[PDB]
A and B are shown apart, each in its own frame.
Chain A
Amino acid sequence: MVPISPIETVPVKLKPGMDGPKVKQWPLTEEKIKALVEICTEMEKEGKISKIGPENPYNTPVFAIRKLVDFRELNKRTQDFWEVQLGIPHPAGLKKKKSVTVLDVGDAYFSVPLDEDFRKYTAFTIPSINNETPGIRYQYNVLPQGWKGSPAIFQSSMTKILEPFAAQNPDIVICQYMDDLYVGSDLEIGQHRTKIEELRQHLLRWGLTTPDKKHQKEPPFLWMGYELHPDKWTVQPIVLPEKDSWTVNDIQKLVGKLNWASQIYPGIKVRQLSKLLRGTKALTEVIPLTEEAELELAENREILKEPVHGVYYDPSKDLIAEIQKQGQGQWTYQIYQEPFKNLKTGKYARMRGAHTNDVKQLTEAVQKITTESIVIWGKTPKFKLPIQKETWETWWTEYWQATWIPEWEFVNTPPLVKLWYQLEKEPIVGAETFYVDGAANRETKLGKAGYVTNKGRQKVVPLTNTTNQKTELQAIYLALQDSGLEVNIVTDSQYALGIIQAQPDKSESELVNQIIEQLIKKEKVYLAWVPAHKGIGGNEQVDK
C-alpha cells in the first residue's frame, strides 16, 4: 500500500449563541429504510462515515430518493465561510491554447475529511423497521453533500494541493473551478497528454480521482451557458417562449435570456420589456405588447437568426471598445482586437433621471465598459466613440462637475454625440434683456408667467393648473419664443437656473423640452440670476 499524502483539515465552528441542529426525523417507508441501510453500510466500509454510539449528539433529517441528508437547520446555524466564487470566468478573457483538457474530479467532497470537532454535529439517524428498535446513528467523517462549508473547504484544499505542480510546470496554465480543472498548454499534443497524466498522478498522490486516461470530455465544451470551441466561443441556444398572453414571469425570463444573449449578439434591446416589467404587482399578469416592443422583438429574432461567435483574447494585440448610440437612452458597444472579430459585445441603459444629455450617458457607458474590461482582461481598452474631440473638450472644460474619459479616438459613425446649445459666459452687448417672472397661487393653482424688456416689450400670460416652478419655466420659455437670435434673460428662479445649468438635451418635462428646442435655435443666450423679492429693477413680481 502506497501511503496517500496528508491533507490538513479546516477548523469549523458554529455561530455565536446558536446550538447544533436538533430536528425530528420524518417517517419513511420500509424500502427507503432498506436503501438507506444498504448505502450507509458501504459508505462506512469506504471510511467516509463512522458509527456513533447512542449518546447525545445532534440529529439531522434524512430522506431517500441515492440518499439525501438535509442540513437545512444546520446551514442556518453553521458559521459563515469566505465567498467561494462571486463571478464565473468569461470566455472572451481566455487566451488561445493549442490544447485544453477538462478534468472533473469525482467524489469531490467525500475525498476531503471533515473537522473532527465538527463531525459530532453532522449526525443523522435512520429509522428502523416499525419503530420497534432504536434508530441507526451515523456521523460524517468527510465533507457532506449539501453542507454550507463543503465548497469553500474543498476548493482551498484543491488549491493547496495544486500549487506545487502548477509552480513546477510553468509551460502550462491551470484554471481552478468549483468541481473542475481546466489545463491549457501550447505544447505538442503528446507532451500535453503526458502532462495531464502527470497532473492526475500528482492529484492521486493526495488521493484525488479524475477520469482515467481519455474518457474525459472533448471540445466543444458546454460550460455555464457557454459553448467553448478550440478557436472561438459562443452562448448556448436561447429559447424564446412565444405566447399571445405575455405574463410578468415570462417577461422576466425573457429579459434575463436577452441580457444573457447580448454579451455576444450585438443590437439586443430590452427597454420596451423592462417598461412592461415596471410594475411588480402580480407574477401571473398578462401584459400586451406595444408596437415598439413588437418591432423590438422582431429585430431581436432577426438578430438571433444567424449565429455569431466571439474570439479569444491575445495579450500581444491592442484592446479596443467601440460605442454606438441606439437612441431612447440606449447604447451598444463591441470589444475587439481585430476588425469584425469581436471579443464580446454589450449594452448600456441610461439611469433613472429627470434630465440628461448624451455626453453624460456616453461617459457612464465608458466607465461601465472600463470596469468590465478591468475585470475580464485586467486593462482598460482604447475607445472609439461617436463624439468629436472639440465637443468633448468644450464639454469637460465648461462642465461644473469633474469628468474624464480614458484614451479614445473619434469614430465617424452617426448618430454623433454633440452639444446642442452653449450659454454665454458674459452678457451680450446689443441683445435685448428680458426680465422674466412667473408665479402661481398654491390654493387655486392659478398663475401667470411673463417678461418685461429694456425696449418696452412686455407680455403676461395667465395659466390654469400650474405651479411656481412651472410658471418660472414658462416665463423663460416665453422670453425665448419672442426674442431674437441673441438675448439676455434675467430670472430669479434657482430651480430653472439649476435645470438649465445641468445642460440637458432631453427631459421628462415637456416644458423643459420646449425650452431646449428654443435654445437650439438661438445664436447666443446669456442667462443671469438675481435674488427674488429684493427690489431688483426688472424683476416684476407684481405682474406675477
Chain B
Amino acid sequence: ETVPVKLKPGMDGPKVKQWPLTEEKIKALVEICTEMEKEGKISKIGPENPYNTPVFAIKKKDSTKWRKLVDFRELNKRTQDFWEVQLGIPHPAGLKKKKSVTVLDVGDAYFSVPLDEDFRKYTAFTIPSINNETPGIRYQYNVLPQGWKGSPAIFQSSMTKILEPFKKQNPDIVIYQYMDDLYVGSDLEIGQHRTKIEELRQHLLRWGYELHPDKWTVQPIVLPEKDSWTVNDIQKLVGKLNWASQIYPGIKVRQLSKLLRGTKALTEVIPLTEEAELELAENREILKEPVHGVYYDPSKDLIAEIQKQGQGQWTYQIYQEPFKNLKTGKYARMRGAHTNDVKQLTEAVQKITTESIVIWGKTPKFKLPIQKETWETWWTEYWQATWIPEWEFVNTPPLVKLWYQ
C-alpha cells in the first residue's frame, strides 16, 4: 500500500516557474516521459492542477544516455518536517573514517512503490515547448519521484529489508543512504572493493564514484619558511597573521611589525631579529594546534565558501560560525575544464556537497564567487548529481583569497 503524506501546517504546494530548456534536452525529456507514462510512473493532468516544479536533463559519468532531474528543492522545504523529524534516516559517523566509500544510484527502486493519492498533485511538472508554440506537457508522479526527500524516508523500510542479509554477512561494510544515492564504505582493496560492489549490486538486482575519505584532513595554516625576507614578505606575513588572530587568539605580530619600522622599499631584504624569529616560531606552534572549541550543531545550517585561486585551483571552507571551520579543502582536478570557470565551479560544488553528505549527512548552503546571471544560465549544463544544494552569490572580492593559498 501507500503511506499517507501531508504538508506543513499552513503551507501550499510548490508553484515554481519552469526555466527554459534547449531543444535536445526537451526531446530527451519528451522521450523519457513518454516511456514513463507507458509504465504508469507518471500520468498527464489537466488545468485543475496549479502546482509546478522545475525539471531538466543531465548526463551521468561514462554514460551518453540522458537522465531526468526534478528540482524538488521547493517541495522539499514544503515537506521539511517529514523526511527529517518524523521519518528521518540517521547518519553514521563511521562513514568518513572508512578508507574507500563508493556511491551508487538506487533510484530505480523508488519507482516500484506507489505514492499517496492525495499528495500526487504536488509533484506536478511541465515539459516546456520551444518559443511557447504549444502548451507544455504537464505530468504528475504516481510513484516515489527521484530527487524528493520523502522518497528515501518512505523506502527506508524496504531498503532495510533488502540490505539485512548483506549487512549481516559483512558487518564491517558501512552503509548510508541519502536521496537516491547509496554510500558504501569499506577498508578493503580497490579490487576486492569493486568485487564487493558487484556483489551488492547483484544482491539489489534480485530484490527488484570511488571516494577515499582516508586521504582528507583539515588543512592547517602554514607560514612561509625563508632565509631572507623582503618588506613585502613581512607585510604579507603580518597581514596573514593578523587575519589568523581572529581564529587563534594568542597570535602576536608586534615584533614582526617592529621590523617594518621605517619607509623601506618593498623589495628590500630585512633580516629577522631574535624577537621576530621567536614570535614567528610561537605563531607556528599556535597554528599547529587545532581550533579551540569547534562543535557541530545539527540544528544550524552548514555554510560553504569557495574562492577561485586561478590556474584551475579552488579553495573552500565549510563552517557554521565564522572563524570556526568544520572543514577546509582545496580542489585542482584536470578533467576537461581548463577553459571554463563555471564548469570547474559546478564540479567543485558537487564535490563539496558530496563530502558534506558523507561527513554530516546534509548539504550546505554555498556562497559562490560568481554572478547570479552567469551561474543561473550555465550551471545546468555541467550538473551530474541527483540532489541540488542551496546557494547565494558574493559579488565583493574577499581579501582573504591568498590567505588560503
Contacts and interface: CB of A to CB of B under 8 A. Distances in A.
Contacts of B47: 10, 81-82, 84, 149, 152-153, 155-156
B264 A537 contact: yes
A502 B377 CA distance: 22
A378 interface: yes
Interface in A376-413: 376-380, 396-398, 400-404
Nearest to A162: B134
B24 to A, nearest CB: 8
B341 interface: yes
Interface residues of A, number: 74
Nearest to B344: A402
Residue among A11, A12, A375, A402 facing the most chain B CB atoms (10 A cut-off): A402
B217 interface: no
Given A379-B22, A402-B374, A531-B239, 14 more contacts: A82-B49, A86-B132, A93-B131, A93-B133, A159-B135, A371-B20, A374-B22, A378-B22, A403-B371, A426-B232, A433-B263, A494-B399, A529-B399, A537-B261
A501 B343 CA distance: 24
B257 interface: yes
Interface stretch (A195-203, A252-260, A362-370, A460-468): A362-370
B52 interface: yes
A497 B399 contact: yes
Interface of A: 10-12, 79-82, 84-90, 93-94, 149, 152-153, 155-156, 159, 174-176, 360, 363-364, 367-368, 370-371, 374-380, 396-398, 400-404, 426-429, 432-433, 435, 452-454, 488, 490, 494, 497-498, 501-502, 526, 528-531, 534-538
Interface string B216-230: 000000000000001
Contacts of B267: 427-429
Given A427-B232, A427-B267, A433-B263, A400 B22 contact: no
Interface in B348-405: 368-371, 373-375, 377-378, 395-399, 401
A490 B266 contact: yes
Nearest to B264: A454
18 contacts: A80-B50, A82-B52, A84-B47, A87-B132, A360-B371, A375-B20, A400-B307, A400-B308, A403-B371, A404-B343, A432-B265, A435-B263, A454-B265, A531-B238, A531-B239, A535-B257, A535-B258, A537-B260
The 6 A-B residue pairs with the shortest CB-CB distance in the complex, in nearest-first order: A378-B23, A152-B47, A537-B260, A93-B131, A402-B341, A427-B266
Contacts of A376: 130-131
Given A427-B232, A497-B399, A538 B263 contact: yes
B315 interface: no
Given A176-B135, A534-B253, A536-B257, A433 B242 contact: no
Contact of B135 (A85, A93, A374, A536): A85
Contacts of A396: 341
Contact of A377 (B131, B239, B253, B265): B131
A155 B266 contact: no
A211 to B, nearest CB: 22
Contacts of A537: 231, 257, 260-264
B58 interface: no
A377 B266 contact: no
Given A402-B369, A403-B374, A536-B238, A501 B22 contact: no
B46 interface: yes
Nearest to B341: A402
Nearest to A526: B266
B135 A402 contact: no
Contacts of B257: 534-537
A398 B308 CA distance: 10
Contacts of A367: 373-374, 377
A375 B261 contact: no
B203 interface: no
Interface of B: 17, 20-23, 26, 46-50, 52, 130-135, 138, 230-232, 235, 238-239, 242, 253-254, 257-258, 260-268, 307-308, 310, 340-345, 368-371, 373-375, 377-378, 395-399, 401
B262 A538 contact: yes
A397 B20 contact: no
Contact of B133 (A84, A175, A526): A175
Contacts of A530: 235, 238-239
Contacts of A538: 260, 262-264
Contacts of A379: 22-23
Given A159-B135, A367-B374, A531-B242, A377 B308 contact: no
B234 to A, nearest CB: 9
A370 B374 CA distance: 10
A10 B401 contact: no
State the majority secondary structure of interface residues on B: mixed
A363 B132 contact: no
Nearest to B394: A401
Given A82-B52, A404-B342, A90 B131 contact: yes
Residue among A371, A498, A534 facing the most chain B CB atoms (10 A cut-off): A534
Nearest to B240: A531
Contacts of B401: 400
Given A378-B26, A402-B345, A11 B48 contact: yes
Contacts of B377: 367, 370-371
Contacts of B373: 364, 367-368
Contacts of A87: 132
B271 to A, nearest CB: 15
A363 to B, nearest CB: 7
Given A427-B266, A452-B263, A401 B310 contact: no
Contact of A401 (B46, B264, B308): B308
A155 B48 CA distance: 12
Nearest to A315: B23
Nearest to A376: B131
A180 to B, nearest CB: 13
B283 to A, nearest CB: 14
Contacts of A401: 308, 369-371, 395, 397
A378 to B, nearest CB: 4
Given A363-B374, A367-B374, A528 B50 contact: no
A525 B344 CA distance: 30
Contacts of B239: 529-531
A427 B230 contact: yes
A404 B49 contact: no
Given A402-B308, A403-B341, A454-B263, A89 B374 contact: no
Nearest to B26: A378
A301 B361 CA distance: 63
Contacts of A375: 20, 130-132
A94 B133 CA distance: 9
B345 A488 contact: no
Contacts of B20: 371, 374-375
Contacts of A156: 46-47, 135
A81 B262 contact: no
Contacts of A93: 130-131, 133
A84 B264 CA distance: 72
A421 to B, nearest CB: 16
A10 B45 CA distance: 10
Nearest to A353: B395
Nearest to B126: A82
B136 to A, nearest CB: 9
Contacts of B258: 535
B254 A535 contact: yes
A404 B341 contact: yes
Nearest to A166: B134
Nearest to A94: B131
A429 B230 CA distance: 11
A494 B239 CA distance: 12
Given A82-B47, A363-B374, A537-B261, A502 B397 contact: yes
